[PDB]
C-alpha cells in the first residue's frame, strides 16, 4: 500500500459514512445508530435540554465514531478496488472518432466527427492505423483488420467487400490500407458497448464462510439487542431504572465488533501474503476463494502458448534444395517486424549459416502486405521472393502461367492438420516449400497441470482459435477439456454455468476477450503481459505471467483459511467473555445487592462502559497485526485442529476481555477521568 | 442426607434406562415404516376404512396435515368448552366458560402446554375433561412424536423427496404406543388410590361437626395420559399433589419415570435408526450431565431452606412450606427439576414457595429451550437444532465445511436453525416486557419485591416454551393474561415446528457423502462439551439480565 492508496481508502471511508451505504453492514450500522444517538444526547445535555454529564457521552460518541471510521477504512483497503472496471473499454469508446465520407465512393472528402454521430446507413472511411468506428460492412477496398479483441489470435485477417469477409467491428485497428465502412448498428448497441455492459454488470458472489459468519453475527446481535433493550422495563419495575445513555452505550458495547472486523483483517493479511508470492491482489475475498476453488478456466493464446506463433520447421517440395528454401525465407522475411517474420529469420539463421546475406543497406526493395495480392516479400537484383498463404500464392503463380504443383497441396494439408499456419515461399515461380508456423507452449506446464489434477482442480482450456489448434495444444499441454471458437459471451456463459452448480471458478486469462469472463469469475488471474482491459477486469495480476501460478495461489489460500479459522475462534470467545465482563455494571443502580456480582471491582457503570468502548476500538485495530503473524500451518485432523484452536486461541480470547477492560479502567481512574 | 439424594437419582436414571431401551426398538420399527409384530391386518382394514391408502408426503404436505389436525382440534375444544351447559355428564350444573378463558384453555391444550388459569374442581364438568382435554392430550402428544419421526427420516433417507404418510404416523403412534401404556399406568394408579368414576360430588360430615364436599371425577385416565405424553394438565387445582392424583410414593416414582420415558426412548431410537448407537448415546450423555447437576443444586438449595424458620422456634430450617408431607423435600426437589426439564409441567410442590435458588434452577431449565429430555418429540428436535448449530460453529472454527451424519449442511439450514432458536427467547423477553409495562399485567403478582417479577417472568417463560407449570401466585385469570399467554403458546409451538419441517424437507433430498478432513466425529467428550457449551451459552447470553433482577436479586437480598 503506497501512500496514494491509503489516502484513497481514507476518502472512501469518509464517503461511506453515509447511512445509505453503511446500511449494508448490520453490526456497523447499529454502531452508527448508537453513535448518532449518543452525540445527540451529548448535544441535548450541553445545551441544557437534559440533565447529566455531557462530556462522558461526548467521549462515548467520539470513540464509537472512531470505531466506525476505522471499520470502514479497513473495509476500504481490503475490498475497495475489487470490482471489475471497464475504464479502458470506455476510454476507447469515448476518445474514438472517424471520418464521414460524402459521395460514398473513395474519391471524396473526410469529415472527422465523433463516433457517436454516426447512424445506420452512413458511409465512414478508415485508413491505416485508425480504429474502426463501429460495426458495418465494407463496401469498397480491402485491408487487414487486427481482430484480437474478438478472437484472441493477434494475426491480421483480411477484410474485403463482396465476399463473406466483409463484416468489421468497432474497436479493432486496421493495419494494411483503406476501406470504406458503412455502419450497420445505431450507436446504442455495438460490440464494444455489449462487452462494456458485460464487464460492469457482472457481480461476484460471497463465499460460504462469509455467509456463515454473517448469520452468526446477526444472531448474536439479535440476542444482545433483546437483552439490553428489555432491560429497561425490568429495571424500572424495582424503583429506580437504568439510564438512557447507559442503555444505548451498553448496546453498542456488547455487540460483536471483533467478528465484524475479522473479514477485513483476513483480507489485508491475504493481500500481503499474495504480494509476497509475486501476485498483485486487489481483493481479499479472492485469496480465500482460491483457497477452495474447483475449476480452472484457461485461455490459450497469451496464457498457455507464448501468443505469437513462432516458426517451427521448414518443409520443402520435391528437389527444391531445402537450404535454398531457408535462404529464401531468411532474405525474404528480413525487413519484417512482426514476431513471425523475425522468428522465420532467427530459425533460418540458427539452423544454417547465412550471416553474410543479412544487411539493410542493400538496394533491394521490400513489397509489404498489400491486401490485394496477399503476399509480402522482397525484390533483390534479378530476384523476386514472395512469402504468402497457400491461395494467394496459387493465384499469383496461376496468373503468371507456371503450373502450380501437386505436392504442395498435400504438404500444406498435412501442416494444417498438424496444427500450424502454413506459408509458402516462391522465387518468382517453382514454389520452394512450406514453412509451418506453430505456436509453442510456454514451458514446464505438463508437470504443473498434473499437480493441479492431483490437488483436485478440473482444468478446462477455453479458446478463441480453431479446433485443430485447440486440440493439439490441449494434448501437448495436458489439460482435460477445451472449447475452440468461443466468443466472449461464450466464455462468460460457461463461467456462469460452472458456478451455478455451487462450485467456485478460477479463470486465468490475459486478453481483451477474457474481460467479461474475468469480471465474473471468483479468482480472476490476469497475466502481466495481458491488455489493460484484462488487467482491470481481473482481481489479481500475475507478475510472473505463468498460467500455473494458481498452484501457489491455492496454497496461500489454504493457509489463509487456517488463519481465518483460528481467528474466528478468538473473536467468538472475546465477544462471549466481554458480555460477562461488561453487563454486571448495569445492575448497580437498581439493587445495591447486585454489587456482589461485580467480580472485577470496576469503578462504576460509566467507567465500565467507557472502558468497553475503548477496548472495542483497540481490539479491532490490533486484530490485523494478529492476522499478519499467522499460525502454524500443519496438516491436522478436524478434531485435533478444533481442540488446538480451542486451547490456544479460544482461551486467550477468554482472558483478553477481563484483563484488557480492567487495565483500561485502572488507567481511567488513575488518570482521574473516571 | 446426601446418600439418599445420590441413591434417588441413581435409581431413577437406572430404572429409566432399563425401561426405555426396549421401547426404543419399537419406535425404531415405527420410524422405519415397518408394522409392529401382530398388527398388520388390523392395520390394513383400519386404513382402508379410514381412507388413508398409503401415499407418501413431501414436507409441505406433512406440515399441512399436522397443522390441519391441530386447527380442527382447536376449533372443537373451543366450542366444546363454551357450550358445556348443553353437553351431558354434568352432575354439578356448571356453566359454560368465558370467551377469554375458553380461548386460553383451548390454545393451551392443543399446543401441549396445559396452562391452567382456572380451577378444575369448579370449572369443568366430566365431559370437558373426558372428551376434550384428554383427547387433546393424546392428539398433541402424537403430533409432537410425528414431527420428530419426519425429522429422523430426513436424516436417514438418501436422495428422496417424501417423508412418509402423516395420518398413518398419527394412528400408529396413538393406537400402538400411547393407549396401551396409558391403560396400564391408569390401572396401577387406580389400584394405589386414584379415582375413576362418574359420581356426583360426595357429601362428607367430618369427625367433628364440620362439612366437606369431595369431588369425584374420572381422574386416573387423564392422570396416566397427562404424565405419559408430557402434557401436565391436572384434573384439580393443585396439579399433581392432590391426594386423588398422586396417592402414594410409588405412584409419584412411576410418574417421574413416565415423564422421561418417551424422550429417552426417542433418543435410543434415533441412535438405532442410523445404525450407529454412539450417535444416540451422545445425546443421552449431554442431556444427563445437565440434568444431574441441576438436580443436585436444587436439592442442596432446598435442604438449606428457609433461614428464618430455625429462629422463629422451629427445630430445623428445611423448606417444607409448599411440599406434601407424603413426599420428602428431596423428592419434591427431584420432581421440580424433572418436570421443568421434561417440559411436562406437572408440579408436585408449590414452586413459588421454593427458595431463591430452588426456584431459579427450574426457571432456567425452562428458558434454555427445554432441550434436556424435553417434551415428547419436542425435546429431541430442539436438541437437534442445537446440534446443527454446534456443528456449524465447529466447522467455522476449523475453517472447513460443516457436516452432520454424512449430509453436508448449507446456509439455508443455518438460516432456519437460527430463526428457530431465536423465536422462543424473543417471545419470552417481549411478552415479559409488555406484561411489566401495563398495570393490568403487573397487578397479578402476589408477592412484593423481585419475587413478583420472578413470578411474571416464570409465567411467560412457561407459556412460551409450552411447559405449563407456574408459580401459581400469579392471579393470571383476566383477558389480558389469557390473551397474552395464548399468543405466546401458539406462536412458540408452531413457529418452532415450521422451521423444523423446512429443515427436514431440505435435508431429505441430499445424499450422505464420505469422510473428509472437515468431518469431526459428533460423539466422544469433545462434541458433548461443545454442545453443552452452545446450549448453556445461548441461554445465559439471553436470560442473564432477566435472572439477575429476579431470582438472584432476591437471593442476594
Amino acid at each position: 500500500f503506497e501512500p496514494t492508496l491509503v489516502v484513497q481508502a481514507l476518502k472512501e471511508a469518509v464517503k461511506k459514512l453515509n447511512p445509505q451505504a453503511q446500511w449494508r453492514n448490520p453490526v456497523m450500522f447499529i454502531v452508527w445508530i448508537g453513535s448518532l444517538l449518543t452525540t445527540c444526547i451529548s448535544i441535548a445535555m450541553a445545551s441544557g435540554a437534559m440533565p447529566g454529564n455531557a462530556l462522558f457521552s461526548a467521549a462515548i460518541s467520539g470513540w464509537l465514531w472512531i470505531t466506525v471510521l476505522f471499520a470502514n477504512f479497513a473495509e476500504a483497503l481490503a475490498e475497495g478496488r475489487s470490482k471489475a472496471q471497464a475504464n479502458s473499454l470506455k476510454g476507447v469508446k469515448k476518445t474514438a472518432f472517424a471520418r464521414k465520407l460524402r459521395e460514398p465512393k473513395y474519391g471524396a472528402a473526410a469529415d472527422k466527427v465523433p463516433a457517436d454521430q454516426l447512424r445506420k446507413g452512413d458511409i465512414v472511411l478508415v485508413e491505416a492505423g485508425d480504429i474502426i468506428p463501429c460495426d458495418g460492412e465494407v463496401i469498397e477496398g480491402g485491408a487487414s483488420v487486427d481482430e484480437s479483441a474478438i478472437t484472441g489470435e493477434a494475426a491480421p485477417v483480411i477484410r474485403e467487400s463482396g465476399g463473406d469477409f466483409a463484416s468489421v467491428t468497432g474497436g479493432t485497428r486496421i493495419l494494411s490500407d483503406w476501406l470504406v465502412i458503412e455502419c450497420s448498428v445505431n450507436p446504442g448497441e455495438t460490440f464494444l458497448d455489449r462487452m462494456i455492459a458485460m464487464v460492469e454488470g457482472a457481480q461476484r458472489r460471497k463465499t460460504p464462510n462469509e455467509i456463515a459468519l454473517t448469520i452468526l453475527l446477526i444472531a448474536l446481535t439479535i440476542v444482545f439487542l433483546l437483552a439490553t433493550a428489555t432491560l429497561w422495563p425490568f429495571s424500572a419495575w424495582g424503583g429506580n431504572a437504568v439510564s438512557v445513555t447507559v442503555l444505548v452505550a451498553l448496546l453498542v458495547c456488547l455487540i460483536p465488533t471483533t467478528i465484524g472486523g475479522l473479514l477485513s483483517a483476513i483480507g489485508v493479511a491475504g493481500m500481503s501474503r499474495m504480494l509476497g508470492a509475486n501476485v498483485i491482489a486487489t481483493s481479499g475475498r479472492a485469496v480465500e476463494a482460491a483457497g477452495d476453488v474447483d475449476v480452472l478456466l484457461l485461455d490459450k493464446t497469451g496464457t498457455i502458448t507464448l501468443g505469437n506463433r513462432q516458426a517451427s520447421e521448414f518443409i520443402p517440395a520435391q528437389g527444391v534444395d531445402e537450404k535454398t528454401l531457408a535462404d529464401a525465407a531468411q532474405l525474404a522475411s528480413l525487413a519484417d517486424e512482426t514476431p513471425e517474420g523475425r522468428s522465420i529469420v532467427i530459425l533460418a539463421k540458427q539452423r544454417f549459416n547465412l550471416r553474410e546475406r543479412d544487411v539493410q543497406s542493400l538496394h533491394a526493395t521490400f513489397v509489404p502486405f498489400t491486401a490485394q495480392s496477399r503476399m509480402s516479400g522482397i525484390n533483390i537484383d534479378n530476384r523476386m521472393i514472395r512469402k504468402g498463404s497457400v491461395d494467394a500464392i496459387r493465384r499469383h503463380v496461376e496468373a503468371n502461367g507456371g503450373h502450380f504443383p501437386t505436392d504442395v497441396d498435400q504438404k500444406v494439408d498435412q501442416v494444417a492438420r498438424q496444427g500450424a499456419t502454413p506459408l509458402v515461399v516462391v522465387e518468382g515461380s517453382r514454389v520452394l516449400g512450406v514453412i509451418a508456423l506453430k505456436d509453442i507452449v510456454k514451458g514446464g506446464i505438463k508437470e504443473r497441470f498434473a499437480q493441479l489434477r492431483k490437488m483436485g482442480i478440473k482444468t478446462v482450456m477455453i479458446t478463441g482459435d480453431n479446433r485443430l489448434t485447440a486440440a493439439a495444444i490441449a494434448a501437448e499441454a495436458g489439460v482435460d477439456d477445451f472449447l475452440a471458437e468461443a466468443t466472449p459471451e461464450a466464455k462468460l456463459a460457461l463461467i456462469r454455468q460452472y458456478q451455478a452448480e455451487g462450485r467456485l471458478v478460477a479463470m486465468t486469462g490475459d486478453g481483451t476477450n477474457d474481460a467479461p469472463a474475468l469480471a465474473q469469475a471468483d479468482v480472476a488471474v490476469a497475466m502481466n503481459s495481458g491488455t489493460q482491459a484484462a488487467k482491470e477486469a481481473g482481481n489479481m495480476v500475475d507478475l510472473d505471467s505463468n498460467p500455473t501460478k494458481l498452484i501457489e495461489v491455492v496454497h496461500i489460500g489454504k493457509q489463509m483459511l487456517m488463519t481465518r479459522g483460528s481467528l474466528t475462534t478468538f473473536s467468538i470467545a472475546n465477544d462471549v467473555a466481554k458480555y460477562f465482563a461488561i453487563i454486571p455494571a448495569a445492575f448497580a443502580a437498581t439493587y445495591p445487592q447486585l454489587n456482589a456480582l461485580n467480580i472485577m471491582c470496576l469503578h462504576s457503570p460509566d467507567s465500565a462502559i467507557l472502558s468497553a468502548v475503548i477496548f472495542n476500538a483497540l481490539i479491532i485495530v490490533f486484530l490485523i497485526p494478529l492476522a499478519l503473524k499467522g499460525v502454524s500451518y500443519k496438516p491436522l485432523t478436524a478434531s485435533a485442529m478444533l481442540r488446538r484452536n480451542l486451547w490456544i486461541y479460544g482461551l486467550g480470547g477468554l482472558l483478553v476481555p477481563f484483563i484488557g477492560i480492567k487495565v483500561i479502567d485502572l488507567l481511567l481512574t488513575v488518570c482521574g477521568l473516571v | 442426607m446426601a446418600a439418599q439424594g445420590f441413591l434417588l437419582i441413581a435409581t431413577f436414571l437406572l430404572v429409566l434406562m432399563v425401561l426405555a431401551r426396549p421401547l426404543g426398538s419399537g419406535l425404531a420399527r415405527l420410524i422405519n415404516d415397518i408394522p409392529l409384530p401382530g398388527t398388520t391386518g388390523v392395520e390394513r382394514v383400519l386404513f382402508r376404512a379410514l381412507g388413508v391408502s398409503d401415499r407418501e408426503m413431501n414436507w409441505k404436505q406433512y406440515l399441512c396435515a399436522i397443522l390441519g389436525l391441530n386447527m380442527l382440534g382447536l376449533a372443537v375444544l373451543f366450542f366444546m368448552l363454551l357450550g358445556q351447559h348443553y353437553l351431558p355428564l354434568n352432575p354439578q350444573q356448571l356453566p359454560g366458560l368465558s370467551w377469554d378463558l375458553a380461548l386460553n384453555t383451548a390454545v393451551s391444550f392443543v399446543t401441549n402446554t396445559n396452562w391452567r388459569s382456572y380451577s378444575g374442581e369448579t370449572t369443568l364438568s366430566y365431559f370437558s375433561q373426558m372428551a376434550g382435554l384428554t383427547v387433546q392430550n393424546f392428539l398433541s402428544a402424537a403430533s409432537g412424536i410425528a414431527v420428530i419421526f419426519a425429522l429422523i427420516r430426513a436424516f436417514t433417507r438418501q436422495s428422496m423427496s417424501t417423508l412418509g404418510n402423516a395420518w398413518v404416523d398419527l394412528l400408529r403412534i396413538t393406537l400402538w404406543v400411547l393407549v396401551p401404556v396409558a391403560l396400564l399406568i391408569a390401572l396401577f394408579f387406580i389400584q394405589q388410590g386414584a379415582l375413576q368414576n362418574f359420581l356426583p360430588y360426595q357429601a362428607v360430615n367430618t369427625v367433628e361437626g364440620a362439612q366437606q364436599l369431595l369431588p369425584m371425577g374420572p381422574v386416573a385416565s387423564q392422570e396416566a395420559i397427562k404424565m405419559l405424553g408430557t402434557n401436565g394438565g391436572g384434573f384439580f387445582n393443585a396439579n399433581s399433589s392432590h391426594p386423588f392424583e398422586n396417592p402414594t410414593a410409588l405412584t409419584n416414582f412411576v410418574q417421574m419415570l413416565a415423564i422421561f420415558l418417551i424422550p429417552t426412548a426417542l433418543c435410543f431410537a434415533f441412535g438405532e435408526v442410523m445404525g450407529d448407537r454412539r450417535q444416540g448415546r451422545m445425546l443421552l450423555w449431554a442431556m444427563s450431565v445437565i440434568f444431574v447437576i441441576c438436580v443436585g443444586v436444587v436439592m442442596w438449595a432446598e435442604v438449606q431452606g428457609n433461614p428464618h424458620l430455625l429462629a422463629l422456634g422451629t427445630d430445623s430450617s428445611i423448606n417444607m412450606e409448599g411440599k406434601e408431607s407424603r413426599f420428602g423435600v428431596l423428592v419434591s426437589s427431584l420432581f421440580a427439576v424433572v418436570t421443568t426439564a421434561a417440559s411436562c409441567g406437572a408440579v408436585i410442590a408449590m414452586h413459588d414457595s421454593f427458595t431463591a435458588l430452588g426456584g431459579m434452577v427450574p426457571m432456567w431449565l425452562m428458558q434454555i429451550g427445554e432441550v434436556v429430555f424435553g417434551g415428547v418429540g419436542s425435546g429431541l428436535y430442539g436438541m437437534m437444532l442445537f446440534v446443527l448449530l454446534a456443528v456449524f460453529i465447529a466447522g467455522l472454527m476449523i475453517g472447513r465445511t460443516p457436516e452432520y451424519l454424512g449430509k453436508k449442511i448449507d446456509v439455508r439450514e443455518m438460516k432456519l436453525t437460527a430463526l428457530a432458536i431465536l423465536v422462543t427467547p424473543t417471545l419470552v423477553l417481549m411478552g415479559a416486557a409488555l406484561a411489566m409495562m401495563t398495570d393490568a399485567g403487573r397487578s397479578a403478582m402476589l408477592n412484593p419485591g423481585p419475587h413478583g417479577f420472578s413470578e411474571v417472568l416464570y409465567a411467560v417463560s412457561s407459556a412460551a416454551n409450552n411447559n405449563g407449570s407456574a408459580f401459581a401466585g400469579l392471579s393470571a385469570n383476566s383477558p389480558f393474561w389469557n390473551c397474552l399467554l395464548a399468543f405466546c403458546m401458539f406462536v412458540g409451538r408452531f413457529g418452532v415446528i415450521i422451521p423444523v419441517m423446512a429443515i427436514a424437507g431440505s435435508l431429505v433430498s441430499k445424499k450422505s457423502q464420505a469422510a473428509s478432513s472437515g468431518t469431526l466425529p459428533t460423539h466422544g467428550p469433545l462434541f458433548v462439551g461443545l454442545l453443552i457449551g452452545t446450549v448453556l451459552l445461548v441461554g445465559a447470553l439471553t436470560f442473564i439480565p432477566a435472572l439477575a433482577l429476579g431470582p438472584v436479586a432476591e437471593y442476594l437480598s
Binding site: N25, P26, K206, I211, T214 | -
Partner: peptide
C-alpha cells in the same frame, strides 16, 4: 404510554425487523 417509551419501542421494533430481514438475505448483507 409516553413519548420516550413509545419512541424506544418503535426503534427497537425497527431494529429487530431490520436484523431479521438481513438474516434472511444474508448474501446481500
Amino acid at each position: 404510554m409516553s413519548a420516550g417509551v413509545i419512541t424506544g419501542v418503535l426503534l427497537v421494533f425497527l431494529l429487530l425487523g431490520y436484523l431479521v430481514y438481513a438474516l434472511i438475505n444474508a448474501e446481500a448483507f
